[PDB]
Structure 1
């Protein structure tokens, strides 16, 4: 869809390394396979938010801040503004804190011309306690608020299908082969940056697509 972002090769690199040198080095090794990188708190808190602008300038890539914002409205607003001011193209936000906390983020993204991704569900074991049960309602809340970008789990294909059903075919969905039957792009981390050779690892993944 013309109004949703285009992720090269439908592959997003989750750059979870905490060392600036390593993060930039490994990303450089696979720069030809991706144009979108997700950066989280581990790297940003260890090296500073300036690392976001460094990635955009060194690789000409889109940066998604995988912060999973989950604070009160006023604080969410401040976190989003600081993150977008640092150059992030998009930010990932939790939906469990409610609609006002999500809208606070949407307001800033609108103002600054950036994007908000709503995290509807997580896949780690502990997600079963409260997150799994609220997933459908969180996705629906996003749809009702005009959210266009979503993050959903990949571990269970049928769950990604359910999410796609709720958000519709128009929405943009990313998830951490069959996954791409429902998601627009997949997020890969360790499988690439920890492999003996990240390039071959990334190349292999894309070939499967």
Structure 2
């Protein structure tokens, strides 16, 4: 249920951390900065070193043909899931889904999201319901939002949520509210002992 946001750009350093917490996470999420610095082969390297599935957080948002060229290369490189925007249209989402498992963005948490993205979350969820992606991604800052989305999201589509909070009990609360996966980064990779931290989040979630 835990997804490690491996936002560590010293390549071998990132790999060491990922290997150390491998037993307590379900997936590793890599972004464009890591792929740019280490190359797209960082995805196969992480898989070989950890045995964990990889989410390529690409936010694809181009026309169908281009989204297709990108997805073919990234899935070919071993990515298990690709994160794609919903706002570019159904055809652009489908061009990626036809090549591999996808996770659709339906809401974001930065101030700018209030301008165009978030006013459309309800509609993006309805679109996701028709597309049937592996899951959707939305902020987990407020467990009430997770539930709101879960109520509207077709059963079977998973919810992945970043930003649930580092306080004791936040991880367990986000899962109970409807998150299938919680995405955690700094609380793990910047801990004095990343494995211990990941293990503690794991324990909180599988506990009571």
Choose which of 72, 77, 81 in structure 2 pairs with 1:86.
77
Match of 1:117?
103
Kindly indicate whether the alpha-carbon contact (under 8 Å) linking 2:132 and 2:157 is maintained by their aligned counterparts in 1.
no
CA separation in 1, counterparts of 2:134 and 2:18? 28
Match of 1:141?
127
Alpha-carbon distance change, 140 to 78 in structure 1, aligned in 2, over 3 angstroms? same
CA separation in 2, counterparts of 1:178 and 1:84? 33
Aligned partner of residue 38 in structure 1, secondary structure: strand
Once superposed, what is the RMSD of the aligned Cα atoms? 1.2
* Number of corresponding residues: 195
CA separation in 1, counterparts of 2:58 and 2:161? 15
Structure 2 residue ranges without an equivalent (≥5) = 163-171
Match of 1:129?
115
For normalisation by structure 2, the TM-score amounts to 0.89
Choose which of 52, 55, 72 in structure 1 pairs with 2:46.
55
CA separation in 1, counterparts of 2:103 and 2:194? 27
Structure 1 residue ranges without an equivalent (≥5) = 1-9, 110-114
Q: CA deviation at 1:141?
A: 0.5
CA separation in 2, counterparts of 1:82 and 1:155? 33
Aligned partner of residue 130 in structure 1, secondary structure: coil
Match of 1:22?
13
Choose which of 198, 203, 208 in structure 2 pairs with 1:207.
203
For normalisation by structure 1, the TM-score amounts to 0.89
Find out whether 1:41 has 2:32 as its counterpart. Answer: yes
Q: CA deviation at 1:143?
A: 0.7
Kindly indicate whether the alpha-carbon contact (under 8 Å) linking 1:35 and 1:60 is maintained by their aligned counterparts in 2.
no
CA separation in 1, counterparts of 2:193 and 2:109? 26
Stretch of structure 1 that moved more, 50-59 or 153-162: 153-162
